Amino acid sequence: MLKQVEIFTDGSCLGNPGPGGYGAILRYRGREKTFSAGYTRTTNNRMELMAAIVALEALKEHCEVILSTDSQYVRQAITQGWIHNWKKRGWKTADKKPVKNVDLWQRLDAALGQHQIKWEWVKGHAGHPENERCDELARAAAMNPTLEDTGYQVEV
């Protein structure tokens, strides 16, 4: 009832780097909206991040969110406060080089600022139906890609 919009996300690739896809589920006022897209060439990390972003950027109202994901990459960054680090030094590293996937981190941070979120880190699909499903969606879009991941940069 007095319920938080619920978001579940998953992203992956067939070969890293290679065609990749995402799957996200948004669950609010009795309704549930899924999203999924395939990318001709990207990385796992990128897809993991992109599912969270697309999901959140879809909320048109200040929500209270519970975001469940098995992503090691987002867990790493959140739990370790990397976004707060980066932000303070203008999104650059030691090197004075732009942070990796800065395009996506900016996007996420921008979404973090509007909502109240609670991260739920999941391990394995057992007892986690919606994550399993996001997985299927992701692997499915990854096969019939239709988008370019413009932010995807060879170099490193």
UniProtKB/Swiss-Prot annotation:
> Which keywords describe this protein according to UniProt?
Cytoplasm, Endonuclease, Hydrolase, Magnesium, Metal-binding, Nuclease
Its UniProt entry gives the catalysed reaction(s) as: Endonucleolytic cleavage to 5'-phosphomonoester
SUPFAM superfamilies xrefs: Ribonuclease H-like
Protein location = Cytoplasm
What does the note accompanying the cofactor annotation read? Answer: Binds 1 Mg(2+) ion per subunit in the absence of substrate. Requires millimolar levels of Mg(2+) for maximal activity. Has low activity at micromolar concentrations of Mn(2+) and is inhibited at higher Mn(2+) levels. Can bind a second metal ion at a regulatory site, or after substrate binding.
Q: Which GO terms describe its molecular function?
A: endonuclease activity; magnesium ion binding; nucleic acid binding; RNA-DNA hybrid ribonuclease activity
GO BP of this protein: DNA replication, removal of RNA primer
Q: Which family does it belong to?
A: Belongs to the RNase H family.
Q: What is this protein called?
A: Ribonuclease HI
- Tell me the organism: Escherichia coli (strain K12)
